[PDB]
Amino acid sequence: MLKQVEIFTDGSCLGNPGPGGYGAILRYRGREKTFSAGYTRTTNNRMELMAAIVALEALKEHCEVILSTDSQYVRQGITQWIHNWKARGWKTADKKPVKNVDLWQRLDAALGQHQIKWEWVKGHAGHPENERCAELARAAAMNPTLEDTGYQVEV
Ligand SMILES: [Mn+2]
């Protein structure tokens, strides 16, 4: 509905897989809600999905949200894969579970509850908020306190 909100999100990881973190800022009429956490072993992709997911789920009513992120991964999937998955039953052409299906589905459910406008940022053109989120993410990744139970260990 109405009620405007601005969300900034970033994800960080030290390896692949390695300790990682996310950072997100929920802003409404000047007020800011900050989010972040570190995980002992995760991926950059998953943190980037986790940042968007946490912020959105923090919303308790239909909102017009402008989602700002530097993630190429999140971008490709919102504009290139999400549609095919939905029509293919969250399965890859050759019928087979997509990577991070747990987070993509949960993020898609998150997006459904609001009218979203994506603001993709490239290189040095992101706002000051996109960098606070990066500091939060990198800080969390250096002091992880949680396990990413949904990550299928690939190594
Ligand atoms: Mn980043």
UniProtKB/Swiss-Prot annotation:
Endonuclease that specifically degrades the RNA of RNA-DNA hybrids. RNase H participates in DNA replication; it helps to specify the origin of genomic replication by suppressing initiation at origins other than the oriC locus; along with the 5'-3' exonuclease of pol1, it removes RNA primers from the Okazaki fragments of lagging strand synthesis; and it defines the origin of replication for ColE1-type plasmids by specific cleavage of an RNA preprimer. Involved in production of retron derived msDNA (a branched RNA linked by a 2',5'-phosphodiester bond to a single-stranded DNA). Changing residue 70 to N: Loss of activity. This is Ribonuclease HI. Gene3D superfamilies: Ribonuclease H-like superfamily/Ribonuclease H (3.30.420.10). Keywords: Cytoplasm, Endonuclease, Hydrolase, Magnesium, Metal-binding, Nuclease. GO terms for molecular function: endonuclease activity; magnesium ion binding; nucleic acid binding; RNA-DNA hybrid ribonuclease activity. Monomer. GO terms for biological process: DNA replication, removal of RNA primer. Its cofactor is Mg(2+). Signal peptide: none annotated. Mg(2+) 2 binds at residues 10, 134. Residues 1-142 form the RNase H type-1 domain.
